[PDB]
Structures are given as structure tokens and as C-alpha cells.
Amino acid sequence: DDLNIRTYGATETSSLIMLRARGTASAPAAVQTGDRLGGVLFRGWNGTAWMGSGQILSVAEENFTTAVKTNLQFHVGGAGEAMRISNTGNVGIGTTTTTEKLNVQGNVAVSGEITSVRSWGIKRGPTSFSANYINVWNSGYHVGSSIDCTTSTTGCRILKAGTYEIRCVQRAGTSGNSVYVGIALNGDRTALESRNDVLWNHSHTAYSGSYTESNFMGTLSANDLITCGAPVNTMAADLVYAVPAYNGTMQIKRVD
Amino acid sequence: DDLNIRTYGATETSSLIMLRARGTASAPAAVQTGDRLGGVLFRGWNGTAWMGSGQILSVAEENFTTAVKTNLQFHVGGAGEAMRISNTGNVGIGTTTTTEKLNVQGNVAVSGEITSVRSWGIKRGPTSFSANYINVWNSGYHVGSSIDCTTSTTGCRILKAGTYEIRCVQRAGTSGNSVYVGIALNGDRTALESRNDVLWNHSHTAYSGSYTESNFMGTLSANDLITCGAPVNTMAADLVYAVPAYNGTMQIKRVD
Amino acid sequence: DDLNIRTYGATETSSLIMLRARGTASAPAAVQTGDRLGGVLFRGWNGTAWMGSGQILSVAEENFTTAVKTNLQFHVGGAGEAMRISNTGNVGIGTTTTTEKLNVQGNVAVSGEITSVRSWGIKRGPTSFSANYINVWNSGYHVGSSIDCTTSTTGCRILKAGTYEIRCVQRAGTSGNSVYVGIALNGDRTALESRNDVLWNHSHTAYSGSYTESNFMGTLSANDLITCGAPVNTMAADLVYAVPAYNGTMQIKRVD
Ligand SMILES: CC(=O)N[C@@H]1[C@@H](O)[C@H](O)[C@@H](CO)O[C@H]1O
Ligand SMILES: CC(=O)N[C@@H]1[C@@H](O)[C@H](O)[C@@H](CO)O[C@H]1O
Ligand SMILES: CC(=O)N[C@@H]1[C@@H](O)[C@H](O)[C@@H](CO)O[C@H]1O
């Protein structure tokens, strides 16, 4: 009891066409949001009834007098709706929320490798001491949409809530005195160091040209400005302030 | 000719319905595992035969008298089956094994950015010496499912086989002696360091408040306990043991 | 009303079959590249016309007398074509250029975790000084396809354009003199350090067994050989050259 559609020709093709209107044939009305345009439905005998065995649906996502917008839905026997393609082209697997081009509710296993754009940012060349834990940096650079290291000379602005890994280093001067730097939230070191869900640390150093370092790992909020510098001005005097990046840098990587 | 299904009105829709049973119309039997519920088949003349030119199948994944579980399969002329949606809603691309929500047998190329949960964990605040290469840590924290840094005070348990990048640092005290720490597998440094598929290193330091560092990068196994500490009890007396994380930390990131 | 296909039996199934040939039934001719084999088309009334409301198409990608190759196309009302499955099985979401098994033209959002192969590589055991900023390394190791750290003893070769995070450390000897190492592009430090789109830094050290470190973050070109070493022979004499990896390493991770 198959259904065959056979077409011979240079430009002709076979079509199964499912059409939907509201109203009647002589008085049709426009499709409304949520209306099903049509579906391919599979059903299987289990011994008692014809059970849902998957389906492929086209469903309106806008009233058609405004715009023709639809989604495609793929359902399986068992889980139900498994995949959705929205009118924007965004795809959801395991979710109907199609915010990004691909949205997976669950884990993803890839046998090969993944390439993508990665948000990261840097500051280079500590040129002066602005405030406790706030160096002024000679330049910044960044990639992606999560971090902005170029707008402000005194830090990197987090643009999106997320998890970040941060390392700041600066060279000690020639005095032989103990120096250190620390990563801070707009110069507030305790705001990061006191959290139970982060790593925050820093070392001391004294040998000329060696690094003191500070590290941070954890979540940050949109509009947070991350800074780094000496804890106090008198210690800043014993650190190297100059343009070359080898004198000191901050590096921020978006981890998730 | 084209097959058109046209539906008007407020409640109904156009539906191509494919139904499958075993036995006969008189003696219907339940669908069995591997039975095809139905399909949309595309065929094309190549001069010799009507060749497989793509198809969308619904197939039973279980005897329906047991459970109604189906998959949807998308095949193309050339590679054959290309994508599968199992009864769990899990999707395989280039593979029929749908362990996770999405599984890709191959590489993935993304033009934008990817957000997900990234497994990482930390120990902070080395407060006593437990054993060679094992500090007791005041607290731990972790994110995700691969690393457990809270159950035990003397290290982080690797919960999933994978690749990890680990850095451990600790401050020298005031003795002036050369000190160091090392990352180890439950106190066994050699079990990590002697492998030809890993990075393992460590530095010495002596300046008060300077950091001695140890690094590892490589695969670890489920149930591994990663520790870090001084190599012998006598050197521990020359390292800083106290609660604040700037005195010492261990950080573990899952890389793959 | 609905179109029902129903089949009872153990061998056959219910199937909509769309067949395409060129020529005529009396003289059929092979399908040609670009020919539509068939489609499942949805259409909806918008007030004045039956508008395209999504469709699933099978389309030839090759002249069938050469080879049977098709793609499957998923179109929604609004964006038009949203997903392509090429004859290779490669899937494109928002792109028809299906270079990898899965290609996404946009961002990806995953609620869980992603596992994949990660390109990374290392060099261990600085054994001798080959030239400025080029140590010879006793061994290397790598995983993935972006980086080769074993073919050349003097560095890691970048095999794919990408963004890389690199850290090089080496132990100071016992001279008491200031020492440092630097990461370089086959010995050329300036080729990396002078770029406005990268991080490049290095520290000094003098304590025996402590690390001098150099760091890099940024894009690199295929065929780049990344080296690390002392800036001149007389400073190499003041660094530790020996086989154990704790004497010196280089670590490279592909970031994107
Ligand atoms: C101790 C010190 O500052 N020495 C610097 C060195 O670090 C720097 O790499 C080089 C410029 O290439 O200039 C030297 O004078
Ligand atoms: C060890 C040292 O000399 N200096 C520490 C400094 O590292 C620490 O960060 C600060 C409290 O925040 O307390 C000082 O005593
Ligand atoms: C003073 C010195 O160099 N000590 C080394 C130590 O760095 C190294 O980690 C260990 C190997 O287990 O062998 C010791 O001799």
C-alpha cells in the first residue's frame, strides 16, 4: 500500500504538499501562531492500539497576516519532541528554547576536535599606579564578546556572566625589597579573595626582573572591571612601570 | 502528479499517517525491534536503476509489547545514514551510538562561541603536611562532574578519565632554604612524572613569600587521587602552612 | 482529510516514495546535479496567498551517471534553509559549506559538558643550546592535529592556523647571575613580541633551581616552528640543561 510519486522531466519534481488555512474554502482565513501546517506521522501496533512512533511537524510561530514564520519539529516514540528548528533557523536538541544557532540540553560528545571563537583578553605594560590594586596599562587587546580589555586603561571589563581564569604578573625593580601585585574587582581585592567559590592567590618576589604573580579562577558578573596592581603606592615604587609587556601583563580567558 | 492534502478550519490539520503492524489485517501482531514504521523515500534514475537518493525513516528500537521506543533516521545518497534521533531524544551525527544528547563522529566547526559547563576544581590553604607530596588543604571547590575537590582534604579525586592541566603553588617560609612542592598521584610523584605522555615539572625557591610551583598536563583515570605537597616532612617546616589561599593552591582544569 | 498508508507483514513497510528522472517514461534519463528528487512541502494561507511554510527537500549534488550524491535540506518559514545534510553526511546549521561533520554558523549553547579531542603539545628536557631562543629538547609529546611537538627537537610546529597559549620555563643554574628564556618563532623573538595582537612576556631569575618563564598568547600560522631558549650562548651557560622535565618545559595549548 505504498504511495509513489513519479516525475519525469528536466525541471519537474515530485511533491507531497500539505496546506493549512483557517476558515472554509470559499472564506479562508490566515494561519495563526501555534497552528500545525501539517505533519508526517508514524504509528505502530503494540497489540492493543496504534501508538505514536515519531512525527515530523511544521508549526506556525507567527500569525501569517504579519509574517510567514514556522518551525520544524522532530518527535520520536519515547521522548517525544527531540529536535526543533525555529523560524530564525536556530536549532534546539532536547529543548524548545532556540536562543542560539544550536542549543543542546545535555552533554555533547565529539570524537574529533572542536574549533570556535574563544573569548580572551590581555593588558600589557604597566605604566603607572592609579590606585591600590589598580595599575594603568599601556595597551589592551581582546577577542570575542565576553571581555573588553580596550575601553578602560585600568582593567578588563567582563561583558557576560561566566567563568574566567586570570593571571597577572609584574617585574620587581632593583631595590631588593619584597613586592607583590594582586588581582582585584575595581581595585577591591577582598571582593574576589573572600569568595568560597573562587581561587585567588598571589606571591611575593624581590629579585630584579622576576615576577610577582596573582591568579584568579571563578565566575564574574557582567560589568565587573578586573584590575591588577600593587597593594599600596610605596610598594609600587619598587615595581617596574614601563611599556614593554615583559614588564607586566594581565591575561583573562573565558573558561566556559 | 503532486499529492496535496488541504485542511481548512479552526482545529484540524493535514497529516500523512503511516501505520505499521506485523501479521495481517485479520491477525495483527505488534511491531518488533528493527521494524520500520514508515518512511519518506527519495529515489532517482541514474541510467540503470532507481537509486537511493535520501530518506527519512522511523524505526522501532524495542518490541512494542515491551515499550514504544523508536528512532528517526536521516539518510542521504552517498554516505547513507547521516543522522539519528534515538528514543531517548539523543542525536548522533555520523554514528548510531547516541550516548549523550548530541554525539558527533568527526570534527565540529563553529563560527561563533560555545558556552557549556567546564569541569575544574581547586584546593586552597595548605594547613599541614600529611605525607610526602600530600598537603592537607583548608578547603576545596569544584564545578562540573569530572573532578571532586571537596570529599577529601588531601587531594582532588578524578571522577572521569580525561586530560587535565594542573598547577600547584606554595609559599616559602623564612628559613632561606631551598624548598619545593610536587604534584603526585596519591603521594606517588613517580607514577605521574615517569610517563612519556605527560608534562610534569617543579621549581625550587627560597625567598620568603615566593612561590615554588609544580605543573602537570596529561590524561588521568577515574578514581585517581591528585595530591600536592612537600617531598619530605623536614622540608615542610620551611614552607608556609596557613589558611589563606595566597599561601598555596592547587588548580585542576579538564582540558578535553 | 489525512492520507493513511497502512501495511501488515514482517517484510514490507508503509512508505511514501518520490521518484525523479529526466527524459520521459518511454526514454528515462539520469538525474543531474541540482535536480530536486522530491520534497515534503508545507504551505499556509496568509490572507491572499498560499505561502511557503517550511519544506524538506532532497536535491542531487552530482550527475547520477557519475555518482549518486544527494543532500537533504530543512527549510522553515522565515529563514528559509536552516539545515543541510550533504552527501558526505556532513551537517550544516546556517551554512551550506559543510566542511566538518558538524558546522554551525553562529553560537552554540550547551547546558552540560562537552568532551572532545584537544590539541596540545609539550617539549621536555633542555639538553643543549642550538641558537638564540632555541633550545634543543630531549623529547616532545602532543595530542590532536594542530601541533607537532615530536618531529623537530628544537620546537613545536603549528599545523593549523589558530590561537595558542604557550608557557616556557627553565631552571637557573648555580652562577648567581640573572638569566631568562624567551619563546620565539624559530629563534626570532621579535617576530612574536612586536605584534599588537598577542601577549608576549618573560621574567628573569637567579636562584639556583628557580624558573625563568616566558609566555605567549595569540594567533599563529601553519608551519610556524615555536622555539624557546636563552637569548645568547653565554646566558645559556648559566641555565640548567639536563634530561629531566623539571629542568625545563614548553607547553602549548590550542585555545580555539
Ligand atoms: C634585566 C632587564 O631588564 N633586562 C632587559 C631584558 O629583560 C629585555 O628582555 C631586553 C630587551 O630585549 O633588554 C634588557 O635590558
Ligand atoms: C607575607 C607578607 O610579608 N605579606 C602579607 C601579604 O602577602 C598578605 O597579602 C597581606 C594580607 O592581605 O598580609 C601581609 O602580611
Ligand atoms: C637540589 C636539587 O637539584 N634537587 C633535585 C630535585 O630538584 C629533583 O626534583 C629530585 C628528583 O626527584 O632530585 C634532586 O636531586
Numbering used by the authors:
A (entry chain C), B (entry chain B), C (entry chain A): 852 to 1107
From the manuscript:
Proteomic and structural analyses of vesicle contents reveal several fibre-like proteins, which we name the mosaic adhesive trimer (MAT) superfamily, and show localization on the predator surface before prey encounter. Structural studies reveal a variety of domain usages (and therefore binding capabilities) at the fibre C-termini, placing these on intertwined trimeric β-prisms. Using independent but complementary approaches, we identified and characterized a MAT superfamily of trimeric fibre proteins with diverse adhesive tips, able to fulfil the long-sought-after role of multiplicity of molecular recognition and handling of diverse epitopes (across a wide prey range), by the bacterial predator B. bacteriovorus.
We next characterized two more divergent NS74s, Bd2439 and Bd2734, obtaining a tip-only variant of Bd2734 (residues T691–L843, 1.8 Å) and a longer construct of Bd2439 (G837–D1107, 1.6 Å). Mapping a sequence alignment to Bd2439 identifies a conserved interfacial pocket (Y1031, R1040, E1044, H1053 and H1055 from one monomer; R1022 and Y1097 from another). Thermal unfolding experiments confirm this specificity, revealing a biphasic unfolding whose second phase is shifted in the presence of sugars that contain these features. Our demonstration of a MAT binding pocket capable of recognizing two adjacent hydroxyls presumably explains part of this specificity, but the ubiquity of this feature in surface glycans and relative specificity of Bd2439 suggest that multiple flanking pockets will provide additional selectivity.
